[PDB]
Amino acid sequence: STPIPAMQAALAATDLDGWLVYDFQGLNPHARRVLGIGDDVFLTRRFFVWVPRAGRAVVLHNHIEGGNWNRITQEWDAELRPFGSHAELDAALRGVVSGQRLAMEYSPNGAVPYVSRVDAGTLERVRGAGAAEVASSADLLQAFLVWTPDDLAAHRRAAALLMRAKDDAFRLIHDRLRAGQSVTEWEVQQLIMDQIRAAGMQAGHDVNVSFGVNAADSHYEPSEQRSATLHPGECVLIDLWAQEPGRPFADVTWVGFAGEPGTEYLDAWQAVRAAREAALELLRSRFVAEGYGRLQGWELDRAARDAMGERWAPHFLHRTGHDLGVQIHGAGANLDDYETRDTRTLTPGLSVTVEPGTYPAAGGFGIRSEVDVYLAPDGPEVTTDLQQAPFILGVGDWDAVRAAGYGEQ
């Protein structure tokens, strides 16, 4: 196969002159992935592949691995240019980069480690060869993550399954509370996992059902060996996800409470809901104003965190959301100004989660509300349901508990 058409199509949406892919052994996994180099290909020497906007790619390779490079590129219609000495390497590099505004796997300030792969010394060498500009390839790399129509349809089937499963899970808890019968996190988790598997889907890791203080630990997963029994007066948080094999996940988080919650929990909910709405509103309003192309992931985190307010933001020690793909935590832009300042631009055809929360462990509780957003070319759209209130579990009939949680009363 040839990787060059896809790389040039990605470049066409930029104003850059080309993409300079550099690798040495395991340094830059993106190099081998974008170029379609098989894992079984043994490459011990450094190489560059220059891909201009239009025209032939240029492969700068050490002459000792010319045979492997002929095989790699036999369908590429590229120039293959061997080098031996550092003088030959530098002359070839000057030939390709001088006066060029180019991208490399580089992240300013090392903000995004998964993209920041080219070593400092090699970047110095590229600049010394006369490159006019070195920009991050992070946005180019996102072009490869665009969903197909079948990907979107599969995501929506997973979303619908999750909406059903979260209702059945919360109804189970509701029924147990009303009946005074014990229920554990693991039992609820397994109800959900059984539904995912029966639908031909898979979760990867077992889903998160958290009661009480466990909901304050984002890194909680109940198991058969260790899981909590629910008691009245404790919160519930369920973060569940599923995909059809090889298709994008859906991934949502819904909350409830065992009985009537107090004012503090309710206030925290309003703050988390306000955070979610602020992120969604900034995404919508920026798209209306200017389309996609300037809005960056970190800005939605800022919107959510600001809107959450001074009482509950100190207990929101997490990013606002993540790229959502065939990997649940996808390789594209995340909604993060917390762990990283993610300056990647939100890209049409990708999807992100919006999942602010607040986690006061000191009883202690955790709230998170997670929806998925597909960055459709005609505008961002939420693909999973919006919770308006925590489910108040064990009081009344389930249909009405659900309706209140949906704001349908």
Q: Which residues are annotated as a binding site for Zn(2+)?
A: 239, 251, 322, 355, 370
Give the integer Cα–Cα distance in Å for 316 and 184. Answer: 26
For 289, other C-beta atoms within 10 Å of its C-beta total: 9
**Type and span of the H or E element at 382:** strand 379-382
**Coil/strand/helix, residue 363:** coil
Which residue in 1, 39, 40, 85 binds its own copies (CB under 8 A)? 85
* Contact pattern from residue 340 through residue 379 relative to its own copies, giving x for each residue in contact according to CB under 8 A and a dash for the rest: xx--------------------------------------
Closest Cα partner for 279 from 305, 318, 315, 313? 305
Identified binder of its own copies from the candidate list 1, 99, 120, 226, rule CB under 8 A: 120
Which residue stretch of 123-131, 239-247, 256-264, 356-364 sits at the interface with its own copies (rule: CB under 8 A)?
A: 123-131
Q: Are 208 and 218 in contact (CB under 8 A)?
A: no
Alpha carbon distance 177, 394 (integer Å): 5
242 vs 140: CA distance, rounded Å: 28
- Give the residue before each break in the chain, using a C-to-N cut-off of over 2.5 angstroms; say none if it is continuous: 362
Q: Is 46 in the site for Cl ion (CB under 5 A)?
A: yes
The smaller minimum CB distance to its own copies, of residues 29 and 204, is found at 29
Q: How far is CA 142 from the centre of its chain?
A: 11
**Upper half-sphere CA count for residue 214 (Cβ side, 13 Å):** 22
| Binding flag, residue 312, its own copies (CB under 8 A) | no
Q: Which residues bind Zn ion (CB under 5 A)?
A: 239, 251, 253, 353, 370
Q: Of 367, 64, 130, which is closest to residue 237 (Cα–Cα)?
A: 367
Q: Give which of Zn ion, its own copies, Cl ion, none residue 54 binds (C-beta under 5 to 8 Å, depending on kind).
A: none
Tell which positions 32-51 bind its own copies, by CB under 8 A: 46
Site for Cl ion in 80-139 (CB under 5 A): 113
Residue among 33, 45, 63, 178 that touches Cl ion (CB under 5 A): 45
Per-residue DSSP letter, 231:
-
Binding residues: 239, 251, 322, 355, 370
Closer residue to its own copies, CB minimum distance, 301 or 372: 301
Q: Which amino acid is at 347?
A: T
Residue 118, interface with its own copies (CB under 8 A)?
A: yes
**Exactly one of 94, 125, 171, 402 binds its own copies (CB under 8 A); which one?**
125
Degrees to nearest 5, angle at CA 311 with 306 and 313:
45
Selection from Zn ion, its own copies, Cl ion, none that 107 binds (CB < 5 to 8 A by kind) is its own copies
- Counting residues that bind its own copies (by CB under 8 A) gives 34
Tell me which stretch binds its own copies (CB under 8 A): 142-150, 209-217, 333-341, 356-364.
Answer: 333-341
Do the Cβ atoms of 351 and 333 come closer than 8 Å? no
Which partner in Cl ion, its own copies, Zn ion, none is near 200 (CB below 5 to 8 A by kind)?
none
Q: Does 86 bind its own copies (CB under 8 A)?
A: yes
Q: Which is nearer to its own copies, 337 or 372 (CB)?
A: 337
CB 115 to Zn ion: min, Å: 20
Rg over alpha carbons for the chain, rounded to the nearest Å, is 25
With 0-12 CB in 10 A as exposed, 13-18 as middle and 19+ as buried, what is 144?
A: middle
Binding site for Cl ion (CB under 5 A): 45-46, 113
Binding site for its own copies (CB under 8 A): 24-27, 29, 46, 64, 84-86, 106-111, 113, 116-125, 128, 219, 317, 338-341
